[PDB]
């Protein structure tokens, strides 16, 4: 947050959210390029001649489609190999966060390795190397169970969503307040 | 009847506050507020004043310093009449400070109705809180109401009355001092809600849970060892005596070992049931 | 609870009296009389041993353990020793007095009930300590896991009397 | 980190000053604490109030008098001299405009981070009638520290002499989802991530002790033999009664 | 308050220090701003307050113990002319004692160290004990009588305190000179 | 600003003194101390009870008798009665013609006290003590403080005269 200072004209914000879609294109770490969404980036920059990598990358990390963001780019970013690598984690870092208490109902943390192998594109061979490198690279935790296909994972990057967890948080406020009524009252009335 | 000394709830702890600089040493304060007697007695405000040279004497007073604070007194709402002066001392059996002779002379002149108070247990500390005053009599004073008659006052079974160095003449006539507490409806809620052991509540679930589940492994290997000891004072009890007769000086000799036998049941199972309710309590 | 608490004083029982009541010796040089806790009446009081006493209202507190140590004439304790017996050969002469005079009577009891004699209450060890011999005494306590107790004759050096000679019996 | 400490001499003292002087909902009294802010532990082992106007009108003007302040706390000297100024307080149940101006003042005179305190006398909902927090700047950024009391051995005995469980700790456990059930959805409405993200940390953190479910009822069961044991012995108790009332009434019998 | 306790400073961890009663107690206090750690010592009169047990000003120092029934005389009046025909003996005293001493920077200048001591024997009379306050009052030097008997004493042990008592009073008066009665008796061990 | 910083430290409590007898209870200790009799003393906060053991000295509390402090075990000053001195005013080349036993010195010396580690990979000891005898006046002087020149630790001095005396516990407390 800076108001009063850092004057800027509309030539410096594009110079400077280059340096700030490169750096998101690689890291893999504090969410993705949706943060440089949140601040007034975007809306004040063009959208096209490549300034728009943050609203088809965005998608990409859902359905998971790599030929609608390297046919719009050039060949500098796309000859390394590293930069399609980091573009599997964040696509399956927003399921993995589903795995306690995001969206899911009974809140109860399992994954096999094909439900994994269709949500993140890839055969049951790569995903388990997938899911290696990124507790290796520090953005997640836990273990690996491939005798019952079980894979668990510690929650460790945080999230910005939300909205989700408000009914599923009252889950545990109804389900505890019928213990008042009937436990907390049994002692009460004692 | 006579004036009841009120303590309220921050006239008890300056006072431990102001004497907290060494043992021998000693301190002096003003007690404020406004009071009628028969009933009425109340301390608004309490103050220290710094330690001189001379001990406790009619020169320890500061009239420039305390000239100084008492107009700071208005500002704040603090400004009372002064009721006496209370002061800090090792104490003694009689007399409790050797060096505090001419002050309440000097004090009865002003006002005769003005007391002094002075923290008797420094280090001594009990929980009875026993505190101690002094006031003189001289002449006059009497025609007027009834000053023992108000609490456990007509006394010399003996010679023993508080400290029993004392008898009659205590400092001087016998003022039979009064401690009382008086409170408001918001300083009473404070203490009984806030005071109880530490501070771990709002929450007591998670606080202690692991804390005693950690140690529950020891305990329930040290809670073995206490019933090992019961019934080996029980078998050896029933094996001495074929009498059933005292020459034993065995006056109540079962209900100690049978409490000890008890009591202790009664402890160890509490605690392994009352805080297993809390110590799952998981659900969902 | 809250009586006994951090603070208490240390005193010598001496006699009982009646129940709730008690003649002690305190240790700062005067004599009172307490009043002995509901507790402790006969079995559980013992005659004349240490205890522990309340320092303002003077009563009984606690049966203090068996304390004989002090600041003059210190008795000292060895506490898990490194010592490994056997450590010097040629001491089988000196190996088989110790095992008999030492680990004999502690470990079996009852060989000495059954041919009717007693054993020992000390033994003489002559010869120049530090060579074979002192090194040894401490390779004792290994195998025996017992208290190792060491005195120096050069020890209880005061000028007053009749501490000196009250250390011996209560070690 | 750190923690602040509040003595209960501290406490009752600063609910004194707003009874005399007819403090009403306009005003907030204010105060100064001393201690010292060196260590981990913050410890305020005095307190006072001081001279202090509030304007509902303008929560820029506020009326303090810095001649009070620095002699109080020298003449205060006398008495300890582990009293230095550590911070301040004021009274009120809530944080204004006139609050966050007012903070720079004795961060002239404040070698360490200044502290900052809240005294309710109402004191509702909860626990913890007065709040702590810290003033410091990388736009003012406040942190609430751990809230505990200690006193020293006559002044908390002296409490139990004036004086002379499960069920709440559901209550207010039940309490805490509804509070935090409010404070989303009105924060929701007002932005249309960052506050929400810290609650997300928490509220995420037989859902994951599925595991050591079937490890927890065989722990539970090892318990309940230590408890049948000694209901055992409680039972045994019973029975020799019974038959030591029986000797009594057959003395009465004869006799 | 100006009658502090006497006591003895035993220890001068950097702030810290430990005090030694006369009273046969032992206490601790920490080191105020008044005391300087070179001031603290034994054998000396420190400043201890009765009541606080507070070390605020120190004591000046008067009577040490020093043992007495020693005589110090400070710069004593006497002179080799006194006594006549001595001129061979005096020639070799002034240059052996009073030449080192009389001139301080001509010999600290040329590294040269003077002799603390010279052997003197001979029958009684001859101006042994004499001349030796001559040596001490061309020099203005204390003169300091280390008396025979008083050697010899009763108690065993007395030795060791009465030396280090004659070099702790020479110590604070620079120009002291220590005089020695009848050396052979404490001379002969064999 | 001396002056306002010295009168601070004029108000603070002291503190007494006692050593440890024997070990009661954790929170229970039996002690003895220096100003008087026994009392049954404790810990109050933050206070390490791993190294208080049996004859350590510790700070006494007045008011609540209590320990609060950690001090090491003395009772007369080691720096006073004991002549104590830090590194050396000779080194070793005066010392010189005693090169022979120098050699000899050092390494029994020197070596061991400043890599003592070496010796326990072997397994063996090294030496404790260090008996040198010979005229007296010549060389002794020098050899005392040329062993703690080359090395530059404390020098303690123990005077034959002061060693026996007629005290309680004289040479047993200097040892």
Redesign the interface.
């Known amino acids: 947050?800076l108001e009063p200072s850092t004057s800027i004209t509309l030539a410096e914000r594009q110079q400077l959210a280059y340096d700030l879609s490169i750096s998101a294109l690689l890291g893999d770490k504090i969410y993705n390029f949706g943060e440089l969404l949140?601040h007034p980036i975007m809306e004040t920059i063009v959208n096209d001649s490549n300034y728009d990598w943050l609203f088809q990358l965005l998608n990409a990390l859902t359905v998971g489609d790599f030929d609608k963001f390297d046919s719009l780019i050039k060949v500098q970013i796309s000859k390394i190999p590293i930069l399609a690598q980091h573009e599997s984690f964040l696509r399956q870092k927003i399921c993995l966060m589903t795995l306690?208490?995001?969206v899911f109902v009974k809140?109860?943390?399992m994954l096999s390795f094909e439900d994994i192998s269709k949500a993140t594109h890839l055969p049951k061979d790569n995903v388990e190397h997938l899911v290696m490198r990124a507790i290796s690279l520090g953005l997640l935790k836990g273990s690996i169970d491939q005798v019952n296909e079980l894979v668990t994972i510690s929650?460790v990057q945080?999230?910005?969503?939300?909205?989700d967890?408000?009914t599923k948080?009252?889950?545990?406020?109804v389900?505890?307040?019928d213990?008042?009524e009937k436990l907390?009252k049994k002692?009460?009335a004692r | 009847t006579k004036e009841t000394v009120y303590i309220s709830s921050i006239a008890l702890l300056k006072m431990l506050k102001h004497g907290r600089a060494g043992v021998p040493m000693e301190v002096m304060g003003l007690m404020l507020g406004e009071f009628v007697d028969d009933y009425t007695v109340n301390v608004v405000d309490v103050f220290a004043m710094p330690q001189s040279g001379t001990g406790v004497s009619v020169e320890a007073v500061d009239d420039v310093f305390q000239a100084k604070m008492m107009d700071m007194l208005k500002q704040t709402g603090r400004d009372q009449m002064v009721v006496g002066w209370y002061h800090s001392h090792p104490g003694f059996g009689c007399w409790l400070s050797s060096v505090d002779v001419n002050t309440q002379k000097s004090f009865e002149q002003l006002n005769s109705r003005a007391v002094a108070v002075v923290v008797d247990p420094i280090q001594s500390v009990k929980g009875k809180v026993v505190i101690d005053a002094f006031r003189l009599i001289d002449t006059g004073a009497l025609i007027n109401n009834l000053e023992p008659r108000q609490t456990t006052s007509n006394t010399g079974l003996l010679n023993k009355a508080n400290i029993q160095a004392l008898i009659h003449g205590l400092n001087r006539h016998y003022y039979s001092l009064n401690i009382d507490y008086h409170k408001t409806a918001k300083e009473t809620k404070m203490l009984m809600n806030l005071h109880k052991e530490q501070w771990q509540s709002g929450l007591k679930m998670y606080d202690y849970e692991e804390k005693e589940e950690s140690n529950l492994a020891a305990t329930k290997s040290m809670v073995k060892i206490a019933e090992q000891y019961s019934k080996r004072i029980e078998e050896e009890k029933e094996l001495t005596e074929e009498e059933l007769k005292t020459r034993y000086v065995g006056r109540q000799d079962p209900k100690k070992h049978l409490s000890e036998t008890a009591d202790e049941t009664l402890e160890n199972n509490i605690v392994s049931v009352l805080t297993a309710g809390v110590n799952s309590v998981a659900i969902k | 609870k809250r009586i006994q608490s951090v603070p208490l004083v240390i005193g010598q029982f001496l006699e009982p009296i009646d129940q709730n009541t008690g003649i002690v010796s305190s240790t700062t040089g005067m004599s009172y009389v307490v009043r002995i806790l509901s507790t402790l009446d006969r079995e559980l009081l013992k005659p004349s041993m240490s205890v522990a006493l309340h320092r303002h209202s003077n009563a009984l507190v606690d049966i203090l353990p068996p304390d004989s140590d002090s600041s003059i004439s210190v008795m000292g304790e060895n506490e898990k020793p490194d010592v490994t017996y056997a450590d010097v050969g040629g001491l089988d002469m000196q190996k088989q007095e110790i095992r008999e005079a030492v680990e004999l009577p502690l470990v079996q009891a009852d060989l000495y009930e059954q041919i009717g004699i007693d054993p020992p209450r000390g033994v003489l060890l002559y010869g120049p300590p530090g060579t074979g011999k002192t090194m040894l005494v401490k390779a004792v306590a290994n195998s025996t896991k017992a208290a190792f107790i060491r005195v120096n004759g050069s020890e209880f050096v005061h000028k007053y009397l009749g501490e000196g000679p009250r250390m011996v019996r209560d070690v | 980190h750190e923690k602040v400490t509040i003595a209960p001499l501290v406490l009752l003292s600063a609910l004194d000053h707003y009874e005399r002087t007819q403090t009403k909902e306009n005003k907030r009294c204010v105060g100064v604490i001393l201690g010292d802010a060196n260590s981990s532990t913050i410890r305020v082992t005095n307190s006072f109030a001081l001279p202090f106007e509030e304007d509902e009108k303008n929560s820029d003007v506020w009326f303090l008098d810095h001649n009070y302040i620095e002699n109080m706390n020298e003449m205060c000297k006398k008495i300890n001299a582990k009293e230095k100024l550590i911070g301040w307080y004021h009274s009120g149940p809530k944080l204004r405009a006139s609050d966050l101006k007012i903070n720079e003042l004795f961060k002239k005179y404040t070698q360490n981070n200044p502290l900052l305190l809240i005294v309710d006398v109402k004191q509702q909902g909860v626990g913890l009638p007065t709040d702590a927090y810290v003033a410091i700047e990388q736009e003012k950024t406040f942190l609430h520290l751990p809230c505990t009391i200690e006193a020293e051995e006559a002044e908390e005995i002296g409490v139990e002499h004036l004086l002379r469980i499960r069920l709440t700790n559901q209550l207010k456990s039940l309490k805490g989802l509804q509070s935090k059930l409010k404070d989303v959805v009105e924060y929701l409405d007002k932005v249309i991530h960052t506050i929400l993200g810290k609650l997300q940390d928490v509220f995420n953190l037989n859902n994951l002790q599925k595991a050591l479910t079937v490890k927890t009822n065989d722990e539970l069961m090892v318990i309940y033999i230590s408890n049948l044991v000694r209901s055992i012995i409680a039972f045994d108790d019973l029975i020799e009664n019974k038959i030591q009332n029986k000797k009594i009434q057959e003395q009465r019998v004869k006799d | 308050q100006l009658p502090y306790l006497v006591a003895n400073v035993v220890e001068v961890v950097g702030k810290a220090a430990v005090v030694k009663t006369s009273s046969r107690q032992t206490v601790f206090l920490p080191m105020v701003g008044l005391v300087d750690p070179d001031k603290l010592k034994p054998n000396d009169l420190v400043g201890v307050n009765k009541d606080s047990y507070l070390i605020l000003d120190t004591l000046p120092s008067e009577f040490d113990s020093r043992v007495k029934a020693m005589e110090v005389d400070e710069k004593p009046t006497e002179t080799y002319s006194d006594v006549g025909g001595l001129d061979k003996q005096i020639e070799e005293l002034v240059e052996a004692i009073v030449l080192p001493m009389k001139r301080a920077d001509k010999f600290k200048d040329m590294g040269i160290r003077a002799p603390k001591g010279a052997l003197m024997y001979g029958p009684p009379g001859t101006g042994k004990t004499l001349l030796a306050r001559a040596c001490a009052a061309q020099t203005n030097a204390t003169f300091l009588k280390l008396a025979a008997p008083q050697l010899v004493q009763m108690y065993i042990g007395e030795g060791a305190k009465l030396v280090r008592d004659a070099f702790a009073l020479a110590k604070e008066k620079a120009p002291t000179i220590i005089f020695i009665d009848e050396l052979d008796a404490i001379g002969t061990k064999r | 600003d001396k002056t306002e910083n010295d009168i601070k430290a004029l108000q603070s409590i002291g503190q007494l003194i006692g050593e440890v007898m024997k070990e009661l209870s954790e929170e229970k200790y039996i002690v003895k101390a220096s100003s008087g009799p026994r009392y049954i003393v404790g810990v109050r906060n933050s206070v390490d009870r791993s190294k208080l053991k049996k004859g350590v000295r510790v700070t006494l509390d007045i008011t609540t008798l209590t320990i609060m402090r950690i001090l090491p075990r003395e009772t007369d000053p080691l720096v006073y009665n004991m002549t104590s001195f830090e590194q050396g005013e000779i080194t070793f080349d005066g010392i010189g013609g005693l090169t022979e036993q120098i050699r000899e010195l050092r390494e029994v010396i020197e070596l061991p006290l400043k890599n003592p580690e070496i010796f326990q990979r072997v397994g063996i000891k090294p030496p404790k003590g260090v008996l040198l005898y010979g005229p007296p006046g010549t060389g002794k002087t020098l050899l005392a403080k040329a062993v703690a020149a080359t090395i530059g630790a404390n020098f303690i001095f123990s005077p034959a005269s002061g060693i026996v005396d007629k005290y309680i516990g004289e040479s047993a407390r200097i040892i």
């Open positions: 947050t949140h306690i208490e995001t809140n109860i943390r929650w945080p999230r910005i969503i939300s909205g967890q408000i948080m009252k889950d545990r406020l389900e505890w307040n213990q008042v907390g002692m009460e």
